[PDB]
Design a protein around this ligand. Structure first.
Ligand SMILES: [Cl-]
Ligand SMILES: [Cl-]
Lengths: 223, 166
């Protein structure tokens, strides 16, 4: 997260850490007690998922849980067209007990509103190219579909939307993939991709447009 | 394809942040360099030079907001710093080498290369048009140089050494 700040601890209790040999590589979002949503480009054959974290050291985080998951399902149209439909659902081996530090979030049914300020959170790179010790939060604003398509065609697809690109240079960055973009109280997007480097004026980042997938998510969870 | 690309210490290769040497598994004595091709006055073709080891380091870049590289990702490959976009690889028809790896000063959002497991290491595969069919990068010997160029079925196999010596 570029030009953000430490999150108020446990203020984003749906945030999931996907870790590989004790190092974070992506985030995800708890959407049901047994399911984590993340970017399909984060797919692995199995996962270790950290819930209830602030720092990434579970042994210093009361209320945290490090949980295993074997099963995950990429959206069937992932990467057709390239970079599009960038979501997957991970089924935890067991359902978690929700608490004030581990809690699911509802997914937006309505599509993003151009101009609206939203929040993104993650443990990815800071402006200085270092990794933060605790979860970072920043606000970014949704850009119109006209601006998104102008900057990203021919790779803009309505399974995506753009946010950020402000004079403020606030953005998501590498290691934030799969984490949440929250708008007006609901999960609206997942961090997906952008033009490098992060935090360029006039160049928003791209997020998975979850309002397009609420039916596939519901059917997958229920199956 | 869901395999993470790893360096010679078994650590995931970073997305753009760190540089690496592409060390040939059976030509560790040689390393990547730029050379002239055709009638060009500036050296813009990539060769494996027996006089440079480990050679010029590269960075592997994907627009995805992840800090590791998978074998399935389309990549740009470039010489030089993250901050510079000179040094970006592309594949260009050039007689009589064929489809030669050359450097350019422009970069697409999505590059045309993938890094794929092969033998004891990795090969570089070039996907014309970012389609489904990939062409292996190997060596073409012309003008006393070993150019990196499409040689489908005969890839140059590399291991990937993080460039912490600089
Ligand atoms: Cl080595
Ligand atoms: Cl000519």
């Amino acid at each position: 997260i570029i030009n953000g700040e430490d999150c108020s601890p446990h203020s984003q209790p749906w945030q999931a850490a996907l870790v590989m040999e004790n190092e974070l590589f992506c985030s995800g979002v708890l959407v049901h007690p047994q399911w984590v949503l993340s970017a399909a480009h984060c797919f692995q054959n199995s996962y270790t998922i950290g819930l209830g974290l602030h720092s990434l050291e579970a042994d210093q985080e009361p209320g945290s849980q490090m949980v295993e998951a074997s099963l995950s399902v990429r959206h069937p149209e992932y990467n057709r067209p390239l970079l599009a439909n960038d979501l997957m659902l991970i089924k935890l081996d067991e359902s978690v007990s929700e608490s004030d530090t581990i809690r699911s979030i509802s997914i937006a049914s309505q599509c993003p509103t151009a101009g609206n300020s939203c929040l993104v959170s993650g443990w990815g790179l800071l402006a200085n190219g270092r990794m933060p010790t605790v979860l970072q939060c920043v606000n970014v604003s949704v850009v119109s579909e006209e601006v998104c398509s102008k900057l990203y065609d021919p790779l803009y697809h309505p399974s995506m939307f753009c946010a950020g690109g402000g004079q403020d240079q606030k953005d998501s960055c590498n290691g934030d993939s799969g984490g949440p973009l929250i708008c007006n109280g609901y999960l609206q997007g997942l961090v997906s991709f952008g033009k490098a480097p992060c935090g360029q004026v006039g160049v928003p980042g791209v997020y998975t447009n979850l309002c397009k997938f609420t039916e596939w998510i519901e059917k997958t969870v229920q199956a | 394809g869901s395999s993470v690309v790893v360096d010679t210490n078994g650590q995931p290769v970073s997305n753009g942040a760190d540089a690496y040497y592409l060390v040939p598994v059976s030509h560790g004595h040689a390393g990547l360099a730029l050379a002239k091709i055709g009638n060009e006055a500036e050296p813009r073709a990539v060769v494996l030079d027996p006089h440079h080891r480990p050679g010029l380091p590269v960075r592997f870049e994907s627009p995805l907001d992840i800090n590791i590289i998978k074998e399935s990702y389309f990549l740009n490959i470039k010489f030089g710093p993250s901050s510079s976009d000179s040094g970006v690889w592309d594949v260009i028809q050039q007689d009589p080498i064929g489809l030669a790896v050359k450097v350019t000063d422009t970069k697409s959002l999505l590059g045309p290369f993938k890094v794929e497991k092969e033998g004891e290491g990795y090969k570089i595969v070039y996907y014309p048009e970012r389609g489904q069919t990939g062409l292996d990068i190997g060596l073409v010997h012309r003008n006393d140089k070993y150019y990196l160029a499409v040689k489908d079925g005969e890839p140059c196999v590399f291991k990937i050494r993080k460039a912490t010596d600089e």
